[PDB]
């Protein structure tokens, strides 16, 4: 719906602790 | 202490990500 939206990745800060 | 406080549940986004 938003006009002009681009594609990018939003990294989750919980992942580094979840993996380790 | 708070006058008029009602009872409800608060969803925790941490628990489902941590469990999975």
Q: What gap in Å lies between CA A11 and CA B14, rounded to an integer?
A: 16
Report whether A16 contacts B16 (CB < 8 A): no
Chain A residues whose beta carbon lies within 8 Å of the beta carbon of residue B14? 14
Block residue for tokens 């992942």: A15
A5: left (phi over 0), alpha (psi -120 to 50) or beta: beta
Q: Experimental method used, please?
A: cryo-EM
- Inform me whether the C-beta atom of residue A18 falls under 8 Å from chain B C-beta atoms: yes
In chain B, which residues have their Cβ closer than 8 Å to the Cβ of A14? 14, 17
- Where are the alpha helices (H) located in B1-20, listed in sequence order? 14-19
DSSP structure class, residue A16:
H
Report the alpha-carbon angle A5-B11-A1, nearest 5: 15
Tell me the resolution in Å.
2.9
Q: How far apart are CA B13 and CA B10, in angstroms?
A: 10
| Rg, C-alpha atoms of chain B | 13
Tokens describing residue B10: 């608060």
């Amino acid at each position: 719906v938003v006009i002009g939206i681009v594609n990018n990745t939003v990294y989750d800060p919980l992942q580094p602790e979840l993996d380790s």
